[PDB]
Write a protein that binds this ligand. Structure first.
Ligand SMILES: N#CC1=C(c2cc(Cl)cc(Cl)c2)C(=O)N2CCC[C@]12Cc1ccc(C#N)cc1
Length: 180
């Protein structure tokens, strides 16, 4: 499983303390589970601006999820998802940062609300994109469909809607079952 995976997580002011922590814990749990594989990880927090919490080359050093995300500061601003995706496509998937030319590129977007910006995201066309929409903001079909534009096709497979943050645990279990 030679995959270069980037977690692009929402750090807007809409996330309460425990909700942000559950997002961080989900990323850590996934990384820990896939530590003995060819997976390589990078994580970017997005709100109004974007910040690479750790790059692929950082992950490779000791593969310590707890340590890699210990200094994360909850941004608590807006939700500029479109710009965040372009940021990942142009500033994170770079060989200079540890990305592997022959690895399959995957982007996991985790958010709890609609984007506060707009923009072309063709820069991420060679990236497999999943989006995890969490919470009441996505309780209606209409709101859920706004996430389709960020994900790969078909949305039925790349868009994951979770009613609560506790469901991240359920999602993780569901994902693990697929690789046997
Ligand atoms: N579906 C799915 C997949 C992934 C994915 C990961 C995260 Cl963190 C969240 C979400 Cl929404 C999707 C993922 O990275 N890959 C690589 C290609 C498709 C797959 C395949 C797969 C690999 C490993 C596991 C595990 N464990 C399960 C499935």
């Amino acid at each position: 499983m030679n995959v270069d995976l980037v977690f692009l997580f929402d750090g807007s002011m809409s996330l309460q303390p425990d909700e942000f922590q559950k997002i961080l814990d989900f990323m850590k749990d996934v990384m820990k589970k896939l530590s003995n594989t060819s997976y390589q990880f990078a994580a970017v927090q997005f709100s109004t601006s974007y910040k690479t919490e750790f790059d692929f080359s950082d992950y490779v050093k000791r593969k310590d999820p707890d340590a890699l995300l210990k200094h994360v500061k909850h941004m608590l601003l807006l939700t500029n998802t479109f710009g965040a995706i372009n940021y990942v496509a142009t500033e994170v998937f770079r060989e200079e940062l540890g990305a592997r030319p022959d690895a399959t590129k995957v982007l996991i977007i985790i958010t709890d609300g609609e984007a506060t910006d707009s923009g072309n995201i063709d820069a991420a066309k060679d990236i497999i994109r999943y989006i995890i929409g969490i919470g009441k903001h996505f309780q209606t079909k209409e709101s859920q469909e706004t996430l389709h534009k960020f994900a790969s096709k078909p949305a039925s497979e790349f868009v994951k809607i979770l009613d609560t943050f506790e469901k991240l645990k359920d999602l993780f279990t569901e994902l693990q079952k697929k690789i046997y």
